[model samples]
Target: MAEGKTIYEGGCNACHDAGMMGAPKPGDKAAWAPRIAKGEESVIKNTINGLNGMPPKGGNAALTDEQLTNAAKYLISISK
Candidate 1:
């Protein structure tokens, strides 16, 4: 969804841009494969609650579940 990219740019781009603290940077195909293997729901749950270096909801508490889902989808989409 278009909203996914919008959400990512607004909330996730910071750390993801540089893979800060091992964030699984955007467009990093290899890095995303394993996580993608875990399935969408798993990824969504992990992202919402924070995993490893990534903060919960990417540090933006204002995000709704739908928005986070969009962001995750967008991140996965481009990180092919």
Candidate 2:
């Protein structure tokens, strides 16, 4: 299965899917615009290191750097 998709549906979904705590929804173009503009590497780093109210790796400490990158990319990919 796709680990990134799974990860998004898991912890990440808690906020992103519903914009909890101001998270950018996957389908909200405007909400994701500035974030996407931050660049892939920057976003990946945010996921790895946490940002604002979002915890590192979306609060799932078990995910590796690779997994976090996959999840970040997946979120960025679907947000249009």
Candidate 3:
């Protein structure tokens, strides 16, 4: 599998790590519910286009949609 860092540090960690805008923390299952309910494809799309508190590409346009999917998967996996 692809490593997780590309997205973690580049996108997720900022708000997630600090609870900014109520983002789900790395291993916080409770916070992952709504996003989880939306499913992987939704998450990937949102991640690509930006969600509530998140910006497009989480502010990194360099990341492809595939990498965003891997990142979301990695995050959801940790919450499990």
Candidate 4:
């Protein structure tokens, strides 16, 4: 896995930090509940491919799969 927190703080935080443009805020259990229910792979896929208002790799296309996976896992970890 990549450095989850690092990647999140670097860019993912931009949206997830405040639910910008519908991005789920980190640590918001309610907002994350449905996505979490979708399971980790689904979350990873969404992060990698993009979903709704969120862009691919959270708008950071340079991010690698491992980094994105780590970031997604990190987001879920806090949502709980």
User: Compared to the true structure, candidate 3 yields what TM-score?
Assistant: 0.84
lDDT tens digits, residues 40-80, model 1? 99999988998878788888989998999989998888877
Looking at model 3, which ten-residue stretch has the lowest summed lDDT? 1-10
Give lDDT tens digits, candidate 2, residues 1-80.
58889988877888888888898988788998898887899999998999998898788979999999998888777786
lDDT of each: 0.88, 0.87, 0.79, 0.89
Which pairs clash in the backbone of model 1?
none
RMSD of 3: 1.8
Q: Judged by lDDT relative to the true structure, which candidate is superior, 1 or 4? A: 4
Return the clash pairs for model 4, or none.
none
Q: Over 4 Å off in model 4, which ranges?
A: none
- RMSD in angstroms, candidate 4? 1.8
Better of 3 and 4 by TM-score: 4
Model 3, position 33: C-alpha lDDT score: 77
TM-score of 4: 0.92
Candidate 3 residue-wise lDDT, 34-78, digit = tens: 778878788788878887788877786777887777888888888
Which ranges in model 3 have alpha carbons more than 4 Å from their true place? none
What would the TM-scores of all predictions be? 0.92, 0.92, 0.84, 0.92
- Alpha-carbon shift of residue 40 in model 3 (angstroms): 1.2
